[PDB]
Design a protein around this ligand. Structure first.
Ligand SMILES: O=c1ccn([C@@H]2O[C@H](COP(=O)(O)OP(=O)(O)O[C@H]3O[C@H](CO)[C@@H](O)[C@H](O)[C@H]3O)[C@@H](O)[C@H]2O)c(=O)[nH]1
Ligand SMILES: Cc1cn([C@H]2C[C@H](O)[C@@H](CO)O2)c(=O)[nH]c1=O
Length: 288
């Protein structure tokens, strides 16, 4: 499986925050937003990842994450010339994806909760169909929305409905088989002139292979779209971290716990950052 992080968009709502800094490099407590969705692809066992951003911000993610091999993964970069919607990721990434299955995660999505990584791996290792993730939210009409039935099987899937048929939001994390690129090629802009992931999910629904994993109320799903939610997501992270002295979405911890790196490689990483807390945190970990 390959991974794609959609990490672009013009950053309107966060102005002036986003005047000279890209949205997904802004802090969520103690590390760049982008670390959060990257962590998720890593835990799913995806080792080969395309990061998409704007022409002016794409180089700045590349300056931060490099080419991935310090995390013992592989990272690549592509420019989205402008934000024509999320399905466009599969067009822009057609060539990085090629022959394989692909998972898409939104660059401004924070996921967290016990057992989450078991769910991610089932999905990441499924070799056909789509997997999407649902979550009971306050104002479901703000999001894609999935209604399902009895057995947990999907009866519909609609983008931002004036009258939502369900509380379960479709979240910014998606797993697909190889058919998705030719799917995204063959549908067209909506009323807001974007290529909609909902219509990508609608297609899989017709093929009879759209799976939902529904996330219960023990998971957290936040997105970092506004000054209010950004700060909220921030408080929520530091509360988890202050308490347990474990970090959320520390990339190097995940590379190592996941096998992508060795103790000795983790130690080479810790070593130059020993002047700061994040480095001592990595070093503590190698000591076990
Ligand atoms: O072409 C694009 C479009 C969006 N983005 C970014 O991707 C994120 C998603 O866009 P946004 O406008 O914030 O959300 P919506 O487009 O309204 O909704 C999408 O993302 C939601 C995630 O909350 C889902 O619930 C919806 O079903 C899905 O349509 C944002 O961070 C954008 O900056 C890009 O980088 N390029
Ligand atoms: C093991 C591990 C889990 N997680 C996250 C995934 C889940 O959302 C939550 C519980 O595993 O913690 C990390 O962020 N980093 C880690 O190193």
């Amino acid at each position: 499986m390959k991974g794609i992080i959609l990490s672009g968009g013009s950053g309107t709502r966060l102005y002036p925050l986003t005047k000279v800094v890209s949205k997904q490099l802004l802090p969520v407590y103690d590390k760049p937003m982008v670390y959060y969705p990257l962590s998720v692809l890593m835990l799913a066992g995806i080792k080969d990842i395309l990061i998409i951003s704007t022409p002016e911000d794409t180089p700045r993610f590349e300056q931060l994450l490099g080419g991935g091999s310090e995390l013992g993964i592989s990272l690549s970069y592509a420019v989205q010339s402008s934000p024509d919607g999320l399905a466009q990721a599969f067009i822009i990434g057609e060539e990085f994806i090629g022959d394989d299955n692909v998972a898409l995660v939104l660059g401004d999505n924070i996921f967290y909760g016990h057992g989450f990584t078991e769910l991610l791996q089932r999905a990441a290792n499924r070799k056909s169909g789509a997997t999407i993730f649902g979550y009971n939210v306050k104002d479901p009409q703000r999001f894609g929305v999935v209604e399902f039935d009895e057995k947990g099987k999907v009866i519909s899937i609609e983008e931002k409905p004036e009258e939502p048929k369900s509380s379960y939001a479709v979240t910014g994390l998606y797993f697909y088989d190889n058919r998705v690129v030719d799917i995204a090629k063959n549908i067209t802009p909506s009323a807001r002139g974007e290529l909609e992931i909902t219509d990508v999910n609608k297609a899989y629904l017709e093929l009879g292979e759209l799976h939902v994993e529904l996330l219960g109320r023990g998971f957290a799903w936040l997105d970092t779209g506004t000054h209010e939610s950004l700060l909220q997501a921030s408080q929520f992270i530091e509360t988890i971290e202050k308490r347990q002295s474990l970090k959320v979405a520390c990339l190097e911890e995940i590379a190592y716990r996941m096998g992508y790196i060795s103790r000795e490689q983790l130690i080479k990483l810790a070593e130059p950052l020993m002047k700061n807390e994040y480095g001592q945190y990595l070093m503590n970990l190698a000591h076990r």
